[PDB]
Amino acid sequence: LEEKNRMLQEDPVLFQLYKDLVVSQVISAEEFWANRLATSQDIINSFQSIRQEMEAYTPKLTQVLSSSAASSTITALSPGGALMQGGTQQAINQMVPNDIQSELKHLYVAVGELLRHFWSCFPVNTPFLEEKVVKMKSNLERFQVTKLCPFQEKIRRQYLSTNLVSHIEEMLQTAYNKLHTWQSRRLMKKT
Amino acid sequence: TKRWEGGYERTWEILKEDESGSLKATIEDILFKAKRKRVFEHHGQVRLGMMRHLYVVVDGSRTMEDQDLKPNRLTCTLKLLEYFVEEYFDQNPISQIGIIVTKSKRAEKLTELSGNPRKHITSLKKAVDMTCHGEPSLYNSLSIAMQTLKHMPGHTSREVLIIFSSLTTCDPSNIYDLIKTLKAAKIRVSVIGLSAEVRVCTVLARETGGTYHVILDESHYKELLTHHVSPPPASSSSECSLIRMGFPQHTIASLSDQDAKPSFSMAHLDGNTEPGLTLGGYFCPQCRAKYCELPVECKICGLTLVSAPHLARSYHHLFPLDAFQEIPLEEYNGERFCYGCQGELKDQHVYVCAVCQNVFCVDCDVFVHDSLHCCPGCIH
Amino acid sequence: RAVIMFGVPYVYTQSRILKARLEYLRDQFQIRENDFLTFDAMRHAAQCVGRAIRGKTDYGLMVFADKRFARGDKRGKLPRWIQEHLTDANLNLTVDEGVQVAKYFLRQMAQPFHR
Amino acid sequence: FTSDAKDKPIGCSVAISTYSMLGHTTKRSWEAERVMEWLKTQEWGLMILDEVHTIPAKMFRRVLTIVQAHCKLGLTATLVREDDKIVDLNFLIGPKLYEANWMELQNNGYIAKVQCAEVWCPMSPEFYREYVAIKTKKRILLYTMNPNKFRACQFLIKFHERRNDKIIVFADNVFALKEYAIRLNKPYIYGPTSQGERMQILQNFKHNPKINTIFISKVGDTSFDLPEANVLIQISSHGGSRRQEAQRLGRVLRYNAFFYSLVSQDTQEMAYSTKRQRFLVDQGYSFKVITKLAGMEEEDLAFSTKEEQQQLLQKVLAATDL
Amino acid sequence: DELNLLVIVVDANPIWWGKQALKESQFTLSKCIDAVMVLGNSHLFMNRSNKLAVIASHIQESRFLYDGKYELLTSANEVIVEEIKDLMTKSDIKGQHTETLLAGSLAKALCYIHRMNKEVKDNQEMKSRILVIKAAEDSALQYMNFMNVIFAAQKQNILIDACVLDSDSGLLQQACDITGGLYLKVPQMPSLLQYLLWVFLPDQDQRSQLILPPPVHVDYRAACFCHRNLIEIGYVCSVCLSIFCNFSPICTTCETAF
Amino acid sequence: GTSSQAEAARILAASWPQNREDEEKQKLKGGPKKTKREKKAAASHLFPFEKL
Numbered sequence A: 001l002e003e004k005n006r007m008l009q010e011d012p013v014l015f016q017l018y019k020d021l022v023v024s025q026v027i028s029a030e031e032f033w034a035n036r037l038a039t040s041q042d043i044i045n046s047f048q049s050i051r052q053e054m055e056a057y058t059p060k061l062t063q064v065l066s067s068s069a070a071s072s073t074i075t076a077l078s079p080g081g082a083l084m085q086g087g088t089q090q091a092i093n094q095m096v097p098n099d100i101q102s103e104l105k106h107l108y109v110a111v112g113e114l115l116r117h118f119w120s121c122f123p124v125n126t127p128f129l130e131e132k133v134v135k136m137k138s139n140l141e142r143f144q145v146t147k148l149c150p151f152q153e154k155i156r157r158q159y160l161s162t163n164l165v166s167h168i169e170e171m172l173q174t175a176y177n178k179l180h181t182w183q184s185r186r187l188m189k190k191t
Numbered sequence B: 001t002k003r004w005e006g007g008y009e010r011t012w013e014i015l016k017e018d019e020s021g022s023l024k025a026t027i028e029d030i031l032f033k034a035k036r037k038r039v040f041e042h043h044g045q046v047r048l049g050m051m052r053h054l055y056v057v058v059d060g061s062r063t064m065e066d067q068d069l070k071p072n073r074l075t076c077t078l079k080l081l082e083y084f085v086e087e088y089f090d091q092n093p094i095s096q097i098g099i100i101v102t103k104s105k106r107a108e109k110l111t112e113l114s115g116n117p118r119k120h121i122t123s124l125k126k127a128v129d130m131t132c133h134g135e136p137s138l139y140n141s142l143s144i145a146m147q148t149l150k151h152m153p154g155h156t157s158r159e160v161l162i163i164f165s166s167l168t169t170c171d172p173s174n175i176y177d178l179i180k181t182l183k184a185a186k187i188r189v190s191v192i193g194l195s196a197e198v199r200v201c202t203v204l205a206r207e208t209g210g211t212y213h214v215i216l217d218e219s220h221y222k223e224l225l226t227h228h229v230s231p232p233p234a235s236s237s238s239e240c241s242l243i244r245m246g247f248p249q250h251t252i253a254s255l256s257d258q259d260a261k262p263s264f265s266m267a268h269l270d271g272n273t274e275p276g277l278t279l280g281g282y283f284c285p286q287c288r289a290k291y292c293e294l295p296v297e298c299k300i301c302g303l304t305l306v307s308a309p310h311l312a313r314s315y316h317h318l319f320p321l322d323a324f325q326e327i328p329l330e331e332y333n334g335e336r337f338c339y340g341c342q343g344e345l346k347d348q349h350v351y352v353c354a355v356c357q358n359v360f361c362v363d364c365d366v367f368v369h370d371s372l373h374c375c376p377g378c379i380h
Numbered sequence C: 001r002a003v004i005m006f007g008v009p010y011v012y013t014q015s016r017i018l019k020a021r022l023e024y025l026r027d028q029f030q031i032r033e034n035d036f037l038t039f040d041a042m043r044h045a046a047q048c049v050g051r052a053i054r055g056k057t058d059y060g061l062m063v064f065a066d067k068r069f070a071r072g073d074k075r076g077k078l079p080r081w082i083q084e085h086l087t088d089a090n091l092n093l094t095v096d097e098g099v100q101v102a103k104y105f106l107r108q109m110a111q112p113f114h115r
Numbered sequence D: 001f002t003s004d005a006k007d008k009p010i011g012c013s014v015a016i017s018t019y020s021m022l023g024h025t026t027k028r029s030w031e032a033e034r035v036m037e038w039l040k041t042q043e044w045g046l047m048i049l050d051e052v053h054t055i056p057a058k059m060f061r062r063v064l065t066i067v068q069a070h071c072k073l074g075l076t077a078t079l080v081r082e083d084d085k086i087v088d089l090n091f092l093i094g095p096k097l098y099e100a101n102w103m104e105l106q107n108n109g110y111i112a113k114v115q116c117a118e119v120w121c122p123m124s125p126e127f128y129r130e131y132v133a134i135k136t137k138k139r140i141l142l143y144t145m146n147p148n149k150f151r152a153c154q155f156l157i158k159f160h161e162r163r164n165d166k167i168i169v170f171a172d173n174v175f176a177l178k179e180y181a182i183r184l185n186k187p188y189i190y191g192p193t194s195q196g197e198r199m200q201i202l203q204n205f206k207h208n209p210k211i212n213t214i215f216i217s218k219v220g221d222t223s224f225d226l227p228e229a230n231v232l233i234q235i236s237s238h239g240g241s242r243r244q245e246a247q248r249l250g251r252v253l254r255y256n257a258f259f260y261s262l263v264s265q266d267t268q269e270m271a272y273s274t275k276r277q278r279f280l281v282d283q284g285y286s287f288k289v290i291t292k293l294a295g296m297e298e299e300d301l302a303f304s305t306k307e308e309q310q311q312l313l314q315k316v317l318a319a320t321d322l
Numbered sequence E: 001d002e003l004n005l006l007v008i009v010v011d012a013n014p015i016w017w018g019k020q021a022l023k024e025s026q027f028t029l030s031k032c033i034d035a036v037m038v039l040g041n042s043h044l045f046m047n048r049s050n051k052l053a054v055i056a057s058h059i060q061e062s063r064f065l066y067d068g069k070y071e072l073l074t075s076a077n078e079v080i081v082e083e084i085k086d087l088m089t090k091s092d093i094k095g096q097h098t099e100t101l102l103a104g105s106l107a108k109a110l111c112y113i114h115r116m117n118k119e120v121k122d123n124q125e126m127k128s129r130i131l132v133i134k135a136a137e138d139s140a141l142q143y144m145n146f147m148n149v150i151f152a153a154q155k156q157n158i159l160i161d162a163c164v165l166d167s168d169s170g171l172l173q174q175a176c177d178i179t180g181g182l183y184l185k186v187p188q189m190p191s192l193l194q195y196l197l198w199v200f201l202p203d204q205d206q207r208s209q210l211i212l213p214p215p216v217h218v219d220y221r222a223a224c225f226c227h228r229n230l231i232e233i234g235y236v237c238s239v240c241l242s243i244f245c246n247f248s249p250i251c252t253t254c255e256t257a258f
Numbered sequence F: 001g002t003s004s005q006a007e008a009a010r011i012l013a014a015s016w017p018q019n020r021e022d023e024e025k026q027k028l029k030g031g032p033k034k035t036k037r038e039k040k041a042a043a044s045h046l047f048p049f050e051k052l
């Protein structure tokens, strides 16, 4: 107990993570410190058609460009246009206040650690690891429900335009899909 | 007898005249002979390589405070080590570098064995303001290097480089037993001393198969490092050696699309300052982890992220371009336009590829053999 | 690699044995007492300093820590194979310059040579 | 055979000696007399002469006639000489056999590509009045001790020491060199100092990072064993000796290196430098003119104020050698 | 003394242009050729010493295409029109090959630039850039040759600009990123000439002054030796650095090397 | 003296070959640099103490 307490005190970030994972019932303290220690002849027909069309070729001047086309191209290339999109998270350094940013970084670190444990468990070569991956998935789901859902609610309340949760969802969805695919393979191997 | 005590050389007898003006043909021949001064190979040395896990051991004793190399040994050594790391990572795509510093009869692993160039350079720059105290310990440094490299795969060439400034080393135990263990571990050890020759370093280099050298000046130091840059020759086929590595595409994000997803970089998350939450970067093909630098092994799934052009840049050595057959212009009964540059063929010799039987002038042949490394006709 | 001579090694004049031989050489072979003492001292110094070079590939450093060696009467007693390498530049140099010379010599002697 | 060790020159294969001893016009030493008598009684094969440029002298020529030899091979680096006595050397020894092309020699990289410089300094007003006032040969010290040239030399010395470059400073008129070297507290060779002191100074000059700059007074105008140097700064050299400047340039080569020449404007030194560089330009070297020194006022230099500059006038006029 | 060389590579794949003509769209191959000619004329107008070269890539081979208007432009346009007419009229489909021989045209362009560089007087530097307009789909069978061409261009410091019309090409993106060139996808095909004059017409030094669209998301997917297909994760040999899609007990390339 | 430093610097630094070079510099350098290679040539022909 005394030895365990001093480790948390030296790293408050880990202490905050320890509370966010153990007190919130996401993971057990036993598992917490365990890890720490082409087509048909129509193509030839089209080729012949274009050959005949370009057989009688004459240069043109007016048809090459028009005032409307040039204006549209300039508008597209003007600052703030489609190709010149000037927003690109205008003030993301000051958007989504740093109080949320610190929480986002903590969530990123926690998700990275959990996924690192999951991928270290992968590939599953022994039946012992099968339960461990299921426990990791359960811990991931509990952490998501505990933190990301309030995080999403806070983001929606403040109406932040950045899709910060989207990347976290992408990694979690990828991990879930990989686990489901591996389980499907495991079922197929037993057939 | 002597070569210079015989007859005086008359080099001007080469030129001759038969039509009172044929010297133009002779000078044209001289100009033609002036070209093709290369062996049609940019390197001409080792045509292959092997993955190297190189460990650099740096002395941190009081002898590094000596001012033999301005301003002192430590600063010049660190600068040349930064240059060596840059060049080594440039010429070795999938190699790894670890750094160990010996001080006060102990060894500290300054940087983990990895392929990131920026991390090593940052650590070296941080180490400039270290404190030089105590005496070096070769035994501890070699023990740490062996322990780290003991579990490495056999196909990789395990190499250890020691920069030994002090002439004295404190060994807690016998060192020759450690040398025998290293020999059994097939670990190559090379030492570049600074002051003078030391018996133990020479014995270690001889037994481990490495090379021992002594620095004369900064230029000699740089030459020795450059010599150490080159990879060792590799056998034709050793084992089933392969590696699972990904090729992360550099997908940036734009706010024009609805998939503009900011993400903090894994490398930047460990920094004290606010990590760069850029629009996009390099996404891991396996776990979609975001990284800014390459080549960097993935922190999450352990996959190796490498850039395909870096690997492909050395592919021309595997399939070198055959030398074209030199044929005089008169004897070639065909087109008189170069197939590569469309220029008129006026030189006395025309080069014809053995595969596509095209025509290339001297300049185009040199360009193909030196830079292009591929025959334009064979591509078609 | 280095052989240091801390002063000219002079045999003890006591025991009344050296002096008898000196007198015998003086009155029989007309040998100066100081000359014979210097000869014996330099012979012993050279004998104990010349054992650092055994073999063509072998190399070493030889230093004499005494100003008395600087005089010609004692340098001339050194063997000829060492005289030519004892340049007049380093005959009375201080400790720091001697250390610098030793550093340069050892640095330049470590390079490979052929047979 | 130089009357220093007398290593039994009688009965020898190769004998090495020097001039001014084979042509003694006075009584000779008994051992030296016997050695000369032995040496004048047999033929010599390939009599080798070093520094052949100063062969046509009053006493050096008869040295050729005082000994008998079959082949006389002369070697030199600076064949240029005044008094047009080089023509006599054509029949004294033989014809000019080989003349190395210095440009292509340094293009191969085996000779240091020395960047020659000719940078002048303006004459301070406190000195120019006295320079134009005096004409009875007392103006040699005046442009020699120009405060502006002193500042330029100090700036060059400090700049090249900050980058760890070996410097050799040539300076004739040893009287000026005294206060030129003691001001910076740097080693100098007066020239009649001793044999040991010069040898040890030159020996510790190369293998010492603490000290890397020395001053030479016309002593380095011959073939010595001076170590490798990258910077040469000559001040107040001889009148028009192209040989001296060529030799001094030869002490640097062995832009790996570069040498500077400091002269005073509106003085005879301008004409002297112009007329003594015509040999090196024929050799292919070009002297870039430097009129401004970067960062002259960046740091503090000697003679910063006018007080010490005008105080220098009394001590430079204190010679009064009459 | 600033010499600018512009080499324009035109994707003349008959299949893609035939499909475009069948679509009866507002953009045709004739308009593309006219836009290329106008761009070349503008490049020649930019400076007296500017040199122009035009190469058209086809399924067969690479063809060197090079009253009130400029005389030299009149001669240049007529030669290009004659060459493109000769290439298209004599273009006969003989075989199953459909991918454009883009790599060979780039190699010919590099050889031509190397030839022109020597003819330049030593007092002047010939800054050379290559502009490629892409119409057909990218070809993965020529990955190695394309990478070799990119490396040669980078070694000789030659800019490579890609103008993708319909389908994005990863190889062109890699070439633009490595050589420092500009990669742009045309939103509206009829406005192609305006894009070419607005973006690719200025030289690199002028590009520093001007504001240009940021580079697109360049991919770096590698090509497997035994499949020649883009892959994200693959096995790479530690000796010859060859890339394989699936694990093998013995390296095929290292087996070849004895 | 404080003024002695300034007076000596003014006299020495611009005595003969600056009172006309500074005037030409002030009356010139109106147009931009023709090419970047001139700076390279200047750096190659300049001595190391003129580069800082």
Ligand SMILES: [Zn+2]
Pocket (backbone or CB within 6 Å): B284, B285, B286, B287, B288, B289, B298, B299, B300, B301, B302, B303
């Ligand atoms: Zn990953």
Ligand SMILES: [Zn+2]
Pocket (backbone or CB within 6 Å): B338, B339, B340, B341, B342, B343, B360, B361, B362, B363, B364, B365, E111, E115
């Ligand atoms: Zn050609």
Ligand SMILES: [Zn+2]
Pocket (backbone or CB within 6 Å): B353, B354, B355, B356, B357, B358, B375, B376, B377, B378
């Ligand atoms: Zn071919």
Ligand SMILES: [Zn+2]
Pocket (backbone or CB within 6 Å): E224, E225, E226, E227, E243, E244, E245, E246
């Ligand atoms: Zn495959």
Ligand SMILES: [Zn+2]
Pocket (backbone or CB within 6 Å): E237, E238, E239, E240, E241, E242, E251, E252, E253, E254
């Ligand atoms: Zn292989």
